[PDB]
């Protein structure tokens, strides 16, 4: 059972592990997230609903007036993506919000029966996400990257030494909300508990409890256990709990009843404990000297005097015991604090605490955050309550409360966003438990603590900021104004919200130009996770621990895809099967193992859930429809891996691929490649420029088709059916009746995008895949995008490669290519550049775009037409004028020379300059397209007007063909309904179709169908009219441009770039190179058959690199092509369909334990010859990642091609004709031409413009810049002798203004003398130091 597009070309699968779950939609994250932000939910606070209900209702400071939110609505987008991209506007929907101004009486208590004013106000346009996952901001496609941050909740951490060479581990708790101040608890070397509010100055931890109204005795009752001391007759007694002692050393002789259990000075073992407990020991007699040091719990006072004998939390003595006895207390509650397990921490912290009561504590807290400002009681209560106990300033979020409650071992997940008094104490308790030794520290790098924020959350937050800015303005105006005249819209401003959101989608670090070199680049960019940007890490902040791959990354984050750079480890590609849980943690699919039998039941487990179960490896061998073959299965739990029995196994990896990301999944023999090289391989696949002919990969994996389809760059069929009309522009498909809805006409139109500019100025072209009259199913590829073959992803071109030295032409990774590659225009690449010419209005007057340009050759003006615009199709080269522009010049004063010169030619040319847009120097191309943007009032150019004529007539044609094909398709259905119960075949075709409004049949369901088709026909008739009026308005509409700008002309140049020495090429195993030479065909090593090799790569760039994948790819590539050469030979000689069928079935069903079965037979003869015609240019094979082809399978395939098992061949030198002295490995490596063309990088400068202040030459090729001669480069000249070279570089080559011109004149005069001066940078330095008020003088000779 294969699909139509797979029947055309089947990939041979060497995979053996049956896929229980297919690769999901790869662009799920971006769409789900943003969809939640705009999604209208009544209850579920997501995006805007949440944002309004959070801020609103806003009530005035006086309390008479309030503004309340009803609902919102997005207007439809003013401009489509197309018009937005051309015009350079943001693709957005207007946000209209219903708001009700309600007013209370001040005279009545809370009478709401005064004024309720309800109206729908505009608050900004929100940018919309495309179906693909992108935003178009100012006519540029951008992607907003998902973010990775610390999940709100609690974290228990510890400086492992660091502070105090004492080497003390100081434990700390950090409570992190989603919004609010941070609450820190920490230990000090002296074991005193401290609180830092908002990581400010230190305060004793007990002070925060006093602020929450805790008496001293209540604090101690919270943290400490109580031990009762009875004073009987004369001897001291204390209530014993059998265990408490436990692992202590007995300080006194412990006697129970009359009989001695412990010996004094011996350690109490388990036997003593169980003996005492079983004897039921409750009193033990003790010496008075043991209480010296015990801490009293409660306040004990003299019932006689009524004064405090001892305060709570006070260290007891022999005399305080005596005083207590004689007062009349024969029971003393004392704290339990035995070092080791129960530490007296809070006891010692109370002694450090300078505060006494609640108020004194609140004052001290107030004085910390606001130091200097006098306390008031109202102020201190307000501040403390507004810190962690205000619903508006503090919000843990659902995820914060949930992680918080699980960390404190609660049962309830959901709860309050504000901190309870219980919460804080539980946190302190756990901190202290961890200090004692029971309980452990949480991991910050653990994915269970790193959460994903995609777009919608971030758009939501910026939108809340906008609302908050608005709330101040609104509340301010509600209080000041009269309430009754004043409506809500005079108070609201749209510009703050629009500005907050504009700044996110445009200025933000996470919003960046889509990387559109190729489909994979796009797809991988949209599934990026960044720990950087706002609310995240910085490069400065980022350590070594965060960057390294943790064990939790398994199945969630790619371990082998990260920028090799400063961003190494902060930016991460998402894994294949990975997804975001409801709270935003990453989760991975796993197959449930029940009673040892491995079900197809699939569970997504979060980072925290995963730790708990034992998960078998994917490669673990299952036994035919039940349990594991092997007794001891290789599994992983508790973040570590080993053998387990079958009964212990809980779960198993879904696919072998789930560990890896998308990009790395496309690398064939990843298993045989070093992880470093593999990283750069996956990174360079993103840099691959699509060639003129998109060639499939012979050695693929299978992700090829998934990526091409999910990227969206391919047109895929929604409805299917049969293709009515193909064209190099459009595909119209007639839908099948089973999916075709009976309401609208069942004809799908896919318009293909023709040769369009990318962000990297690469070429985006869609070509039709299917032929005229081809039957297709839902989800079949109808048209190929730029770097896609029949449905599969095709990043570059496979080539006959031989590993062997040439005459140093492949020295260090240098590549030797055959001329045949250039001839066949393989790796010829298409680039479309956009140049704009802006007509501005200046103080002197408006700039003119005339062809009438002072001082210009007829050669130049030949190419410009009447208006001053170059013609479509015109080839241009550097310095040719594209759009002629002249600027009004004010002062006309001339140097005497210019007076003479202007007198000689008499070409006074009034007083206009030349500011024409001309082709940049050294770029040369053909003009493919021209666009003109004019304002409204100003008279249109002749050329602008003919452009509008074309767009108008073309619009008319487009809409006319819509109504025509839609009416033909609609009456074609009426014709079939009328035949149903009314045979009039030939009789209905003869009378005109235009006079079919009269035609009906008897009143049944079929008469109602005729009514549906008739109402649709007329609906389309008026729809066509209003569509055409819209188009006509937009074409006539004068576009609002920047202030100053009258009109803009955009020229699009096209360039065909040939492969050439200096160009950068790589494979998919991170094997790069620069092309050194293009060898004539004659010269290249050739086979016994006479066929020359395409590329000669250096053997020495393999064993050091340890990317052995490229060699396996080459052997299999040759085997693939071996079988393609057999099929090519059988197709050239026609032969039998039976014989082709035989060979091809034996081929597909080769592999030792091939998962993929192909029972050829069912294929019809016509399907088989279309299939062979595609297999002829090499049978495409798929080697999954970690479940790839084995050596023995590759050699078996080679034998089927009659190629050698070694995959080494005899080669002959093209030059000499003699044979090479040993066999050479030859085969097909799929190669990529990266974006790094020498054409773009070569730059040179003699003299140019110079910097403003420093007077040094500028930097960069775009600014025609000199190369930077850095400190490092200077030192080199210092080490040498070279003093004159250095001075040159410092002076006449850089700042020295007089010197550089003087030495230029000398070099043209041929004097080659320096005449140095003083660098202007130094003159500046002096002026900058004197501006500081330091006298710095040059002291003369």
């Amino acid at each position: 059972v294969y699909s139509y597009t797979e029947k055309k070309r089947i990939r041979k699968d060497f995979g053996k592990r049956p896929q229980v779950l297919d690769v999901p939609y790869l662009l799920s994250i971006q769409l789900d997230s943003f969809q939640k932000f705009i999604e209208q939910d009544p209850e579920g606070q997501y995006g805007l609903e949440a944002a309004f209900r959070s801020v609103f209702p806003i009530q005035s400071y006086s309390g008479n007036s309030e503004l309340q939110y009803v609902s919102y609505r997005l207007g439809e987008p003013v401009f489509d993506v197309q018009e937005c991209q051309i015009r350079g506007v943001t693709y957005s929907a207007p946000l209209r919000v219903k708001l009700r101004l309600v007013i209370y009486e001040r005279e009545a208590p809370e009478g709401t029966v005064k004024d309720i004013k309800e109206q729908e106000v505009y608050m900004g346009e929100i940018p919309l996400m495309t179906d693909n996952g992108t935003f178009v901001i100012n006519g540029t496609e951008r992607v907003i990257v998902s973010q990775l941050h610390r999940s709100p909740g609690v974290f228990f951490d510890s400086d492992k030494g660091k502070t105090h060479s004492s080497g003390k581990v100081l434990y700390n708790a950090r409570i992190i909300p989603y919004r609010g101040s941070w609450l820190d608890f920490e230990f000090d070397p002296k074991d005193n508990l401290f609180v830092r509010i908002d990581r400010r100055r230190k305060l004793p931890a007990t002070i925060i409890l006093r602020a929450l109204n805790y008496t001293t005795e209540q604090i101690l009752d919270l943290f400490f256990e109580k031990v009762i001391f009875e004073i009987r007759d004369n001897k001291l007694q204390m209530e014993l709990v059998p265990e408490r002692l436990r692992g202590e050393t007995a300080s006194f002789d412990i006697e129970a009843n009359g009989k001695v259990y412990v010996e004094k000075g011996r350690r109490i073992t388990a036997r003593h404990i169980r003996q005492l407990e079983k004897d039921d020991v409750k009193l033990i007699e003790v010496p008075v000297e043991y209480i010296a040091g015990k801490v009293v719990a409660k306040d004990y006072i003299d019932e006689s005097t009524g004064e405090l004998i001892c305060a709570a939390n006070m260290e007891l003595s022999l005399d305080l015991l005596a005083k207590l006895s004689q007062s009349g207390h024969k029971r003393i509650e004392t704290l339990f604090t035995n070092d080791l397990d129960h530490g007296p921490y809070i006891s010692e912290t109370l002694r450090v605490d300078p505060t006494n009561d609640r108020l004194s504590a609140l004052v001290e807290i107030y004085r910390m955050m606001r130091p200097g400002e006098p306390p008031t009681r109202e102020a201190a209560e307000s501040l403390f309550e507004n810190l962690f106990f205000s619903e508006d300033r503090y919000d843990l979020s659902a995820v914060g409360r949930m992680k918080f409650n699980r960390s404190l071992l609660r049962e309830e997940i959901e709860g309050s966003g504000i901190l309870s008094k219980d919460d804080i104490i539980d946190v302190m308790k756990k901190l202290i438990d961890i200090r004692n030794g029971k309980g452990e520290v949480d991991d910050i790098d653990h994915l269970g603590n790193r959460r994903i924020r995609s777009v919608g959350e971030m758009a939501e937050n910026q939108f809340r900021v906008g609302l908050v800015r608005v709330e101040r303005a609104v509340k301010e105006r509600l209080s000041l104004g009269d309430l009754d005249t004043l409506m809500p819209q005079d108070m609201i401003n749209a510009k703050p919200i629009s500005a907050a959101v504009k700044e996110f989608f445009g200025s933000s670090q996470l919003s960046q130009f889509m990387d559109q070199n190729n489909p994979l680049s796009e797809i991988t960019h949209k599934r990026r996770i960044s720990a950087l940007g706002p609310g995240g890490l910085t490069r400065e902040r980022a350590g070594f621990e965060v960057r390294d791959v943790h064990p939790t990354h398994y199945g969630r984050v790619c371990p082998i895809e990260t920028p090799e750079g400063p961003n190494i480890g902060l930016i991460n590609s998402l894994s294949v099967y990975a997804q975001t849980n409801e709270y935003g943690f990453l989760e991975t699919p796993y197959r449930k193992v029940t009673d040892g039998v491995v079900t197809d039941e699939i569970h997504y487990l979060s980072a925290i859930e995963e730790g708990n179960y034992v998960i078998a490896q994917a490669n673990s061998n299952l036994d035919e429809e039940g349990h594991f073959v092997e007794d001891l299965v290789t599994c992983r739990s508790k973040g570590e891996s080993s053998l387990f029995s079958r009964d212990q196994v809980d779960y198993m990896d879904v696919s072998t691929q789930q560990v890896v990301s998308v990009g790395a999944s496309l690398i064939p023999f990843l298993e045989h490649d070093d992880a470093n090289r593999a990283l750069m391989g996956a990174n360079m696949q993103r840099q691959a420029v699509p060639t003129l002919r998109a060639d499939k990969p012979l050695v693929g994996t299978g992700m090829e088709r998934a990526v091409a389809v999910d990227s969206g760059v391919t047109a895929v069929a929604k409805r299917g059916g049969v293709v009515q009309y193909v064209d190099a522009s459009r595909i119209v498909i007639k839908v099948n009746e089973d999916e075709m809805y009976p309401g609208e006409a069942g004809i799908d139109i896919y318009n293909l995008t023709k040769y369009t500019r990318s962000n990297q100025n690469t070429c985006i072209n869609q070509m039709p895949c299917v032929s005229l009259g081809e039957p297709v199913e839902r989800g079949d590829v109808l048209a190929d995008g730029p770097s896609t073959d029949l449905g599969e992803l095709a990043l570059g071109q496979n080539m006959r490669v031989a590993f062997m030295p040439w005459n140093g032409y492949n020295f260090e990774d240098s590549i030797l290519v055959s001329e045949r590659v250039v001839q066949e225009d393989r790796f010829t690449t298409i680039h479309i550049q956009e140049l704009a010419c802006v007509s501005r209005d200046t103080k002197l007057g408006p700039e003119e775009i005339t062809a009438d340009i002072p001082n210009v050759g007829e050669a130049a003006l030949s190419k410009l037409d009447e208006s001053g615009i170059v013609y479509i199709g015109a080839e241009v080269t550097g310095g040719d004028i594209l759009v002629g522009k002249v600027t009004p010049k004010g002062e006309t004063q001339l140097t005497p020379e210019e007076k003479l010169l202007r007198a000689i030619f008499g070409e006074k040319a009034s007083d206009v300059k030349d500011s024409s847009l001309r082709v940049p120097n050294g770029v040369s191309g053909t003009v493919i397209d021209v666009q003109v943007f004019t304002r409204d009032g100003v008279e249109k150019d002749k050329r602008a007007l003919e452009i509008e004529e074309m767009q108008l007539k073309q619009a008319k044609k487009d809409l006319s063909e819509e109504l025509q094909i839609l009416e033909a398709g609609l009456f074609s259905r009426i014709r079939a309904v009328l035949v149903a119960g009314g045979v009039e075949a030939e009789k209905l075709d003869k009378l005109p179709r235009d006079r079919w409004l009269e035609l009906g049949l008897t009143d049944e369901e079929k008469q109602n169908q005729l009514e549906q088709l008739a109402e649709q026909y007329d609906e389309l008739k008026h729809e066509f009219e209003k569509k055409l009026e819209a188009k006509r308005r937009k074409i006539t509409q004068g576009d609002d441009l920047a202030p100053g700008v009258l009109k803009i002309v955009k020229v699009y140049l096209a360039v065909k770039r040939r492969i050439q020495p200096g160009d950068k090429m790589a494979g998919r195993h991170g094997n790069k190179g620069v092309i050194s030479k293009i060898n004539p065909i004659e010269d290249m090593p050739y086979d016994e058959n006479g066929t020359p090799v395409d590329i000669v790569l250096n053997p020495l760039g393999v064993p050091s690199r340890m990317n052995i994948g490229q060699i396996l790819e080459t052997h299999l590539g040759m085997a693939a092509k071996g079988i393609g050469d057999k099929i090519n030979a059988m197709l050239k000689q026609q032969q039998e369909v039976a014989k082709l069928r035989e060979f091809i079935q034996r081929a597909y069903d080769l592999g030792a334990d091939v998962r993929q079965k192909v029972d050829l037979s069912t294929f019809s003869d016509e399907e088989v010859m279309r299939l062979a015609e595609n297999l002829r240019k090499g049978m495409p094979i798929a080697t999954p990642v970690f479940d790839g082809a084995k050596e023995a399978e590759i050699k078996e395939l080679l034998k089927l091609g009659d190629l050698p098992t070694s995959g080494q061949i005899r080669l002959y030198d093209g030059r000499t004709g003699e044979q090479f002295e040993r066999p050479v490995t030859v085969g097909y490596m799929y190669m990529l031409k990266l974006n790094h063309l020498v054409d773009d990088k070569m730059h040179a400068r003699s003299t140019g413009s110079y910097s403003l202040v420093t007077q040094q030459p500028l930097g960069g090729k775009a600014q025609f810049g000199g190369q930077r001669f850095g400190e490092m480069e200077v030192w080199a000249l210092e080490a040498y002798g070279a003093a004159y070279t250095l001075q040159e570089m410092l002076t006449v080559k850089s700042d020295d203004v007089n010197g550089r011109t003087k030495m230029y004149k000398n070099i043209v005069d041929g004097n080659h003398q320096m005449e140095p001066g003083m660098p202007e940078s130094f003159n500046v330095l002096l002026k900058e130091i004197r501006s500081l008020g330091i006298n710095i003088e040059l002291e003369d000779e």
Partner: protein, 277 residues
């Protein structure tokens, strides 16, 4: 540890007397007659009023303290021109003056380039109009749409919105992080490149050699006219001041010098070669 200029000043203000109605009247009568202490006490007691309006005037141009100081200038003028004879209270009158002086300072010091309040006031109405248009037109105001609503010239609306453009920082970088500053992209234009400067040195040098190649009387009236050799660039009629003293003979001899020099450029290899330039 009170180090902040703001918190120090606000501490000093709180430490003042708050005035009543009859007290304002007593002090105000003494103040206008010219009391030292009365002026000081009325000002110091009403500083809190400045702050309450100064706190609601931040995040627009200057800082809180900056606005507080200019607001205080309004308080002084308010005490000088307060009328205690009118039954109506001081706080009401002072609020006007404090808002006036703050607004005026915010209109001047903020805009880097000194702008007139006349253009600023016009701008205000253009912006308010834009706000009302934006609420009903879901899009944003065009210059033409605003101009239609005020019944004013499109050109005048465009000139105004052209003065609204804020100034960008050159010291501030653009290239993602700190890779290059706007200063280092932007070249000195008034300054010619050494190639252009050297080209002028060659023309000027050539002229000296070209002057000693034509007639002695053909380069005595051709250069003393253009100001090539002479001190002042004269005209056909003004060459008569020297020795020429003619109108016809000067015009024949100027052009006779240029015609022989045109053949000197056709033969050396320029003429149409140096015509494009």
């Amino acid at each position: 540890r009170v180090l902040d200029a703001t918190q120090l000043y606000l501490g000093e203000i709180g430490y003042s007397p708050l005035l009543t109605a009859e007290e304002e009247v007593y002090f105000a009568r003494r103040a206008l007659r010219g009391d030292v202490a009365s002026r000081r006490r009325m000002i110091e007691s009403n500083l809190r009023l400045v702050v309450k309006i100064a706190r609601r005037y931040g995040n627009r141009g200057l800082a809180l303290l900056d606005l507080i100081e200019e607001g205080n200038l309004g308080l002084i003028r308010a005490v000088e021109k307060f009328d205690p004879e009118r039954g109506f209270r001081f706080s009401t009158y002072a609020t006007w003056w404090i808002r006036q002086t703050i607004e005026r300072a915010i209109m001047n010091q903020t805009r880097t380039i000194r702008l007139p309040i006349h253009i600023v006031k016009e701008l205000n109405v253009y912006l308010r109009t834009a706000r009302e248009l934006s609420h009903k037109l879901d899009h944003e105001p065009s210059a033409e749409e605003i101009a239609e609503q005020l019944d004013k010239p499109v050109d005048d609306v465009s000139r105004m919105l052209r003065l609204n453009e804020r100034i960008t920082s050159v010291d501030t970088p653009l290239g993602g992080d700190s890779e290059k500053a706007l200063l280092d992209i932007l070249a000195d234009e008034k300054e010619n490149g050494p190639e252009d400067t050297t080209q002028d040195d060659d023309m000027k040098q050539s002229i000296v050699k070209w002057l000693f190649e034509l007639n002695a009387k053909q380069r005595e009236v051709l250069a003393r006219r253009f100001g090539l050799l002479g001190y002042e660039a004269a005209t056909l009629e003004d060459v008569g001041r020297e020795i020429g003293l003619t109108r016809e003979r000067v015009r024949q001899i100027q052009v006779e010098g240029l015609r022989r020099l045109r053949e000197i450029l056709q033969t050396q290899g320029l003429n149409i070669e140096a015509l494009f330039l």
